[PDB]
Amino acid sequence: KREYKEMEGSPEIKSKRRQFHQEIQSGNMRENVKRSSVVVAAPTHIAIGILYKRGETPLPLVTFKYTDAQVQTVRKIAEEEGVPILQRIPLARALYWDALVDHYIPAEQIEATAEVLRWL
């Protein structure tokens, strides 16, 4: 179950869940990129993978988070794998801080994520 489950637990447990899911993230990077529909980025700072396909995913799913120089390797891998990459700084930051990897997007980012998927 990839449910974010927002109405459940303190900000403390949510941070433990984020860390725990990040700790099991991998992956490797190539596979993470390949399984994504789109990457949302803050260049040289943040890359977040998003998967959304009608019929498989009820909501957009966060597939990975990478930071700093890794973003440049994500960009290169995305180009080789044909995964579009978009600069969306506020969305990249919010997903960085709040989203759990391998879970559906938080409620607060539904509007912004929908915007990128219309583009895609």
Next chain:
Amino acid sequence: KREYKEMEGSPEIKSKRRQFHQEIQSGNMRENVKRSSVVVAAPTHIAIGILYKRGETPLPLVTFKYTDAQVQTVRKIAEEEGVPILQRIPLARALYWDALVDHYIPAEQIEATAEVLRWL
């Protein structure tokens, strides 16, 4: 030399430097906390260590970055070691993204960092 060296290199090299310095960060956590003067935090999201002592450090130095559930362990260690911990969300975020660990604070955060050190 703990010089941030801001007028040098692209945002790309700065991200490689950040990652590289983060990769050699440790540390362990207890030692990182003990060597700090103060911790600046965004609760459940970010803890940044700052060291400043007249005569040793020309400028405040960033000693560590920790995120998510680690912040709770930082808080507990800081209490045991007598290191004050302050909630400063915009400063914590800016240092998270821009500062290099074991280097002097970026120029943009001089004003905000000075503010916390007057308090301390």
